[PDB]
Design a protein around this ligand. Structure first.
Ligand SMILES: NC(=O)c1ccc[n+]([C@@H]2O[C@H](COP(=O)([O-])OP(=O)(O)OC[C@H]3O[C@@H](n4cnc5c(O)ncnc54)[C@H](OP(=O)(O)O)[C@@H]3O)[C@@H](O)[C@H]2O)c1
Ligand SMILES: NC(=O)c1ccc[n+]([C@@H]2O[C@H](COP(=O)([O-])OP(=O)(O)OC[C@H]3O[C@@H](n4cnc5c(O)ncnc54)[C@H](OP(=O)(O)O)[C@@H]3O)[C@@H](O)[C@H]2O)c1
Ligand SMILES: [Mg+2]
Ligand SMILES: [Mg+2]
Lengths: 414, 414
């Protein structure tokens, strides 16, 4: 009802598991709450400039704004935080992007970001993390970090199945667990909240499958399965076992030494990709102490959350970390940082995150030239130390830029 | 049957919620698997030296070795990994300490470390983390880190309640969830593992209670409740709500500004202790970017695992991180790092972790003088760069020492 489909522009379609993108594709976008009002306009201009430069005017995106979050309430009404139309529009146009999102509290509403991911079944949470020269970082050698996180995005405790303490449902579940399943490990059964942790084999192998194919298509060195399987054997541990099994079953994985590591040969470059695994808590230590040993990462939903945020912070890219939610039919790229209401509307915020997510979007669309130009632009702008306040306040000799001005700096460095 | 109670020596007792420790207390200790054979003898000698120096020979510990893990199998038999006697002996002597521990794989045995914690109901996992000058660290300013982690140690998914995919029990649980609880969020119900996440109110407030009393007795600046309550509202979020409520209920917590932070006045120093909270994933970023803003931390079992390991790695103390498991009746201090079988028996390993855990043990025993001397010793030895290979290999100008030699260096610096 309130969305306006672009007069000029054409729908992207999916054929043969492959995207068919017109030169004039219509792309849905969500402004985002808080600073989304600052970063998204900058993102629109940077992407258009990259597309214009790369294809000489032969291609052009027809942006179409759709709504979710606060602006949705103001467009559709009181408690319309996520209109069904938004979901239909992302399905119909295949690819879309959105800015910061905030969930309401006090109304029993669960995460809108997760709702998008689960109802569009974007089971892949892709977070590429690497260091941009010139970025202020808390660690000594952030350049050693160059990883690609494949976060399972549909299942685990992150899936929102739980019951409140003292509620009739929670006591019912606890009764079933203690009396019918013989559970004795619940230390305090009364006044106790209960949550469910699911992890299936199909969900695990389509995620790991995507991670290995990514390592192959991008010639990466290895794929590490991160889990907490020594404590959670049937979910975390199963994820790791199913991951190795997939590698053996579909990619000719061979045993390295006496195991458990495997090696998969890259069908295109002949490189032997190492398949290995590391327990999650020790991994949070290894990304700091031996970051160069890791590359592509495959893990569950919650651990992926933790890992991606920790890696982003160590390379100083907490506000420029790109992110994408991908499934077999649809794809939603997104800022990954918060709404930042206290600077919203001041044209202060750092647009690097949503812009790099737009870079991932264009590359996903096959427009690798334009995506390359955006990376080049971020490269030069940050290296030139012409950046926003979140960077500049942590360093010396930098030129402070507004959010919009930083967008121009990126374009200038393309 | 194979343990030998010290001829000379007396049992520690608990009276009025307060430990009564004799000058000649008997202390049970577990050597530990792998490098435990290297670090524990060094720990024994360092503690004895600190006790001898601090009380002029008037006090002395009567060590008593008890077994768990591989040595237990070789002492008690084939699959005796954790003899009931060990548990009885820790109960009877109140305080004990143990080296690295490894769980068997392939026999359906769950974590021995967790088994100890849950059957002795040591619901407090205490991990003090701060930087020792001279320690090689991956971050720029490790000195800014000075935190005390209070990890809930008895409940959460860490409690081992789960069922294997395709097993009759898992399908039974899934059937109950879908058909009797109306669960629709399990993406793939078949071939799916299931785990249970419990979190009670009593378990939460006795843990947070201990953290606040610790902030009071040690005059710390604040207590931060770390959780992932925006996704797991009834466990993680409940933990955070119950934490604030406890602070209000028992420590006169007052609202700061418009909330949610609270302030508790230290009854002994008048200092206003800040009670606040931070979402777990963002917290893993904050410990790196703004470490000086945090002090005492209160959180659930799994997050505590992650947080303590990440903090230990950033201050370069992955092998010297002290740790303790404390309950209302018993206490078990422990190395916190792995078994390191590939250097076991070579007198290479770093004994700093179990020694600092022994320092926590002595202080818990009221022997603060002796504990102070151990900290002093670690202080000087590390600052003097006379350390073991794990430190020395990451730095220049250091004097390489064997594990035992490092123990002597600590004594020499008391
Ligand atoms: N991908 C997303 O769309 C996304 C992700 C995460 C959260 N959020 C949402 O946003 C809402 C806003 O509220 P909050 O203020 O309590 O957020 P918050 O806890 O996420 O704050 C993140 C902090 O990072 C900094 N920051 C974030 N984005 C930045 C940018 O672009 N440039 C510079 N600094 C940036 C600000 O810290 P300082 O610079 O002040 O230190 C900021 O307040 C949250 O409720 C959350 O629902 C959206
Ligand atoms: N608190 C405990 O008692 C405790 C804790 C955690 C694990 N463990 C147990 O130990 C077993 C041993 O097997 P793993 O070798 O596969 O272990 P692992 O994955 O824990 O290895 C930890 C790594 O840290 C280093 N390290 C650990 N302790 C060290 C010390 O004291 N000094 C110097 N470096 C040290 C070694 O790495 P590099 O120096 O080689 O890089 C080491 O292999 C594990 O199965 C686990 O059950 C015991
Ligand atoms: Mg996250
Ligand atoms: Mg741990």
């Amino acid at each position: 009802s309130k969305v306006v489909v672009p007069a000029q522009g054409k729908k992207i379609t999916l054929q043969n598991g492959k995207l068919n993108v017109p030169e004039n594709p219509i792309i849905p976008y969500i402004e985002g709450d808080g600073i989304g009002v600052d970063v998204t306009p900058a993102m629109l201009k940077v992407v258009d400039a990259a597309v214009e430069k790369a294809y000489k005017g032969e291609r052009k995106i027809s942006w179409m704004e759709i709504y979710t979050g606060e602006k949705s309430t103001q467009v559709y009404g009181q408690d319309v935080w996520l209109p069904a139309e938004t979901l239909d529009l992302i399905r119909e146009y295949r690819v879309a992007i959105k800015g910061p999102l905030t969930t309401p509290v006090g109304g029993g509403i669960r995460s809108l970001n997760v709702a998008l991911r689960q109802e569009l079944d974007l089971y892949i949470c892709l977070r590429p993390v690497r260091y941009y020269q010139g970025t202020p970082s808390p660690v000594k050698h952030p350049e050693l970090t160059d990883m690609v996180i494949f976060r399972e995005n549909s299942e685990d405790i992150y899936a929102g199945i739980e019951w409140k303490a003292d509620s009739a449902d929670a006591e019912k579940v606890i009764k079933f667990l203690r009396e019918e399943m013989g559970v004795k490990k619940i230390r305090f059964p009364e006044h106790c909240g209960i949550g469910i942790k699911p992890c299936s084999e199909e969900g695990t192998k389509r995620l790991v499958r995507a991670a290995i194919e990514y390592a192959i298509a991008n010639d990466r060195d290895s794929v590490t399965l991160v889990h907490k399987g020594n404590i959670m054997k049937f979910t975390e541990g199963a994820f790791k076992d199913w991951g190795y099994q997939l590698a053996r079953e579909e990619f000719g994985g061979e045993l390295i030494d006496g195991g458990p590591w495997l090696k998969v040969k890259n069908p295109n470059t002949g490189k032997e990709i190492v398949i290995k695994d590391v327990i999650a808590d020790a991994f949070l230590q290894q990304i700091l102490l031996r970051p160069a040993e890791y590359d592509v990462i495959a893990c569950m939903n919650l651990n992926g959350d933790y890992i991606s945020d920790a890696l982003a912070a160590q390379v100083g890219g907490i506000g420029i970390a790109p992110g994408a939610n991908i499934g077999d039919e649809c794809a939603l790229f997104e800022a990954t940082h918060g709404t930042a209401p206290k600077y919203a509307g001041q044209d202060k915020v750092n647009p690097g995150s949503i812009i790099l997510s737009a870079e991932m979007m264009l590359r996903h669309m096959g427009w690798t030239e334009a995506a390359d130009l955006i990376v080049k632009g971020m490269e030069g702008a940050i290296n030139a130390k012409t950046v926003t306040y979140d960077f500049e306040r942590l360093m010396d000799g930098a030129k402070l830029l507004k959010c919009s001005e930083f967008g121009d700096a990126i374009i200038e460095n393309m």
